[PDB]
């Protein structure tokens, strides 16, 4: 095992590239990093609990893990009020102790185990060229991923349910008894346009849809796991792909980049799997809340909000979407596809109903709209809330903003990693990753371009 | 032998004067479509209701613009993020009014430049090159995707994307500053470091190589004729350039390895433009620049201004006047 650049040809800043053909040390690096991930989860949850005022909204306190635990239906009641501090602390303690175990295991394999696992066992020994063993490891990880999806399903169906922001009576921890097993709905979520009003899979709007999709995902992942364990890669796959460790890393980097982009869009737009009681309003929710708040205020002042025309000729409070639905006016016309549990009571078949706006607005909807409008995901890097022209007195940046920004940056840099590693994998498998051979420089044997 | 294999060999040929490749089979149609629609729209598109308030903005040359003021105006705020192709319009005139050309040009352009980056990798692979020129090109691509796609997505409307014109770009930048305080954002500062340093180091590299050229011409002819294309030998004395630059600052501040110097020349503006692309992409989600407004108070509690407060006065003046007829409520939520 080379630990210097004369013995490896990799400098120290590329030094983990010395681990490419050292399987046991590579397993140790992974387990040690996994331990880092579980350590952050545990220690950050303990920090968030220690910095938690439970009578204060979670989105007001810069918390990102307690909303995730609360969305699963742990320690929360109707409208996201924290009934119990203890489940969040339990989740933190469990991750922190498992991380200690994982760090010990990673450090063992990285510093005292077999450096290569192929001289000890044929089960854990992997060669990157060995397509069958790598597909077996794919199959194992697929089986466990399907089990995790089914574990989420088990939590939502048989272990107290999850937080439904759309539940009648207001959002609450409810048990999903009828998940949609219909493949038309589940897989037509995949065929919906990734644009306005359709939103691809970001527009999943009910806990039944999410739980049925996770049953389908668990079934698909377990079936695919059994597939990669029982089959070898076919000739089209072997002829199209690069079969090397850097190649498999770059394939995973491309997938990770995709998933980080999707998560940023998911936390920015979806309020079903990211409920606004925990993550705060979305940008669309806050803009629609501002329009609704001033509709309510001016209606209380006697203004005819239907017949009120604005300075431009459009309605000041109510207008038509380009397909004709009755929507809020002002710049929020762009956010007319927003659906939220405080606003769907006032929506008729044609859009915002005039009768419901006239005589069915409840005080809790007014309170929720004012809170969401004043908690719009707008904030300075130093956490100063509101528009950037505001003075320094409101310490707020939405968790949706933090999560979307972070995961968009991570998705981009992991697309950069995919490009760097996909190109290097192709160059190294082709043999010119170290530069052009002077004697056999390929351009020197080509005809001139003109 | 097969027709498909003959087509594959033509597509992947290094003997094409312009390399096509499989990424080029997507690049060329999308870029030609975007180019043709951009030229036709820049000359002769009718005015576009960008703010969705029936206030159409003349963007094209035939409607009173010059080259500086001309733009392909972004699609309507009433559309928002909605997909608006030609076949979703009741007529071509409606499509033009609502800013459909911007959506067409921007979507085909973004596909085309992503395929340009893929094609750069593809040709480096066919030429036996190292593959990371496409990584350097991913910094302008990320910046273009930030201002044409990611900022509309975060703001929720393609009307918020940068206009395809010179004065439209200036309008985008000024509204960006008034709303996000991009100058106070450290990612933009890293971008300014990237472009200022990239130009600095371009001037340095060029000036040192031009300074240390080996005498191979007379004083009459241009010194560039001292280099022959495909010559084996070095055209300039790197050791002389290093001796000069390690006496200009000090010895250990100067590169002697040309490969480390060129990696630095590649890496500095690319990392700067990556950071500023991420800055614009994160102010898409309203994570704005630093707010130091009323940060200094006296012991009574009165606000003592700084330069950030004067900057905020400028930002307010830009904000209260922007999209003057589009706001109906007290806060510009997005």
């Amino acid at each position: 095992g080379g630990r210097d650049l004369p013995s490896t040809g990799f400098a120290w800043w590329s030094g983990n590239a010395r681990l490419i053909n050292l399987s046991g040390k590579l397993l140790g690096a992974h387990v040690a990093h996994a331990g880092l991930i579980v350590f952050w989860a545990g220690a950050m949850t303990l920090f968030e609990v220690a910095h938690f005022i439970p009578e204060k909204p979670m989105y007001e306190q810069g918390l990102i893990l307690l909303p995730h635990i609360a969305t699963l239906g742990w320690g929360v009641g109707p409208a996201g009020e924290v009934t119990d501090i203890f489940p969040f602390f339990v989740v933190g303690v469990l991750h922190l102790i498992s991380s200690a175990v994982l760090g010990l295991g990673g450090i063992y394999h990285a510093l005292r185990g077999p450096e290569v696992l192929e001289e000890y066992s044929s089960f854990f020994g992997y060669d990157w060229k060995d397509k069958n063993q790598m597909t077996n490891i794919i199959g194992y990880h697929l089986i466990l991923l399907g089990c995790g999806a089914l574990l989420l399903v088990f939590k939502a169906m048989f272990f107290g349910g999850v937080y439904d922001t759309w539940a009648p009576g207001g959002g609450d921890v409810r048990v999903i008894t009828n998940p949609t097993l219909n493949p038309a709905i589940i897989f037509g979520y995949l065929l919906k346009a990734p644009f306005g009003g359709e939103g691809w899979i970001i527009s999943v709007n009910n806990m039944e849809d999410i739980i049925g999709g996770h049953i389908w995902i668990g079934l698909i992942c377990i079936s695919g796991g059994i597939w990669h364990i029982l089959t070898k890669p076919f000739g089209w796959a072997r002829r199209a792909l690069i079969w090397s460790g850097e190649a498999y890393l770059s394939y995973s980097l491309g997938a990770l980049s995709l998933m980080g982009f999707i998560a940023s869009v998911f936390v920015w737009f979806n309020n079903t799997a990211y409920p606004s009681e925990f993550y705060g309003p979305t940008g669309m929710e806050a803009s629609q809340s501002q329009a609704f708040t001033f509709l309510v205020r001016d209606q209380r002042l006697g203004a005819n909000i239907a017949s009120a025309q604005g300075p431009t000729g459009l309605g000041k409070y109510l207008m038509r979407s380009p397909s004709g639905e009755i929507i809020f006016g002002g710049e929020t016309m762009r956010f007319w596809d927003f659906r939220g549990p405080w606003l769907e009571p006032l929506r008729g078949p044609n859009g915002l109903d005039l009768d419901k706006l006239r005589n069915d607005i409840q005080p809790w909807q007014v309170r929720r709209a004012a809170e969401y409008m004043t908690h719009a995901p707008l904030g300075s890097l130093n956490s100063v809330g509101g528009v950037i022209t505001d003075v320094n007195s409101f310490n707020y940046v939405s968790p949706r903003a933090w999560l979307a920004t972070s995961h968009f940056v991570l998705g981009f840099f992991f697309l950069v990693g995919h490009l760097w590693h996909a190109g290097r994998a192709r160059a190294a498998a082709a043999g010119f990753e170290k530069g052009i051979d002077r004697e056999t420089e390929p351009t020197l044997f080509m005809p001139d371009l003109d | 032998a097969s027709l498909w294999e003959q087509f594959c060999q033509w597509v992947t040929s290094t003997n094409n004067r312009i390399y096509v490749g499989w990424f080029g089979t997507l690049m060329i149609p999308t870029l030609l479509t975007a180019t043709t629609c951009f030229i036709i729209a820049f000359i002769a598109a009718p005015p576009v209701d960008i703010d969705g308030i029936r206030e159409p903005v003349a963007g094209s040359l035939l409607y009173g613009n010059n080259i500086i003021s001309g733009a392909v105006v972004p699609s309507s705020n009433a559309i928002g993020l909605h997909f608006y192709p030609i076949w979703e319009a009741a007529s071509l005139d409606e499509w033009l009014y609502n800013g459909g050309p911007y959506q067409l040009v921007v979507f085909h352009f973004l596909i085309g430049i992503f395929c340009y980056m893929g094609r750069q990798w593809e040709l480096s692979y066919r030429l036996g090159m190292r593959p990371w020129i496409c990584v350097a090109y991913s910094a302008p691509v990320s910046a273009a995707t930030a201002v044409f796609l990611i900022y509309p997505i975060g703001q929720g409307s393609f009307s918020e994307g940068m206009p395809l014109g010179i004065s439209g770009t200036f309008n985008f930048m000024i509204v960006f500053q008034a709303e996000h305080n991009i100058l106070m954002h450290p990612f933009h500062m890293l971008g300014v470091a990237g472009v200022f340093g990239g130009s600095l180091f371009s001037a340095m590299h060029g000036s040192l190589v031009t300074s240390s050229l080996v005498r191979e011409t007379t004083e009459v002819e241009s010194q560039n004729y001292g280099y022959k294309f495909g010559q084996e030998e070095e055209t300039y004395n790197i050791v002389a350039a290093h001796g000069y630059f390690g006496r200009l600052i000090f010895q250990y501040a100067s590169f002697n390895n040309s490969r480390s110097l060129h990696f630095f020349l590649g890496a500095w503006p690319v990392i700067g433009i990556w950071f500023t692309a991420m800055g614009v992409s994160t102010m898409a989600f309203n994570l704005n620049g630093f707010n130091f407004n009323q940060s200094i108070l006296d012991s009574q509690g009165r606000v003592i201004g700084t330069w950030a407060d004067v900057l905020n006065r400028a930002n307010i003046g830009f904000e209260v006047m922007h999209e003057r007829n589009a706001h109906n409520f007290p806060l510009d939520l997005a």
Binding site: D448, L449, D450 | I18, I43, L61, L62, N66, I67, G70, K228, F229, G230
Partner: peptide, 30 residues
Amino acid sequence: MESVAYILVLTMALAVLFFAIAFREPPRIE
């Protein structure tokens, strides 16, 4: 009528681009 002048100068730049690509001096190894 300024539109004609703008079209001419943009067309001159694009024609220069075409003739510089299609009819460059070929780089020759010698």
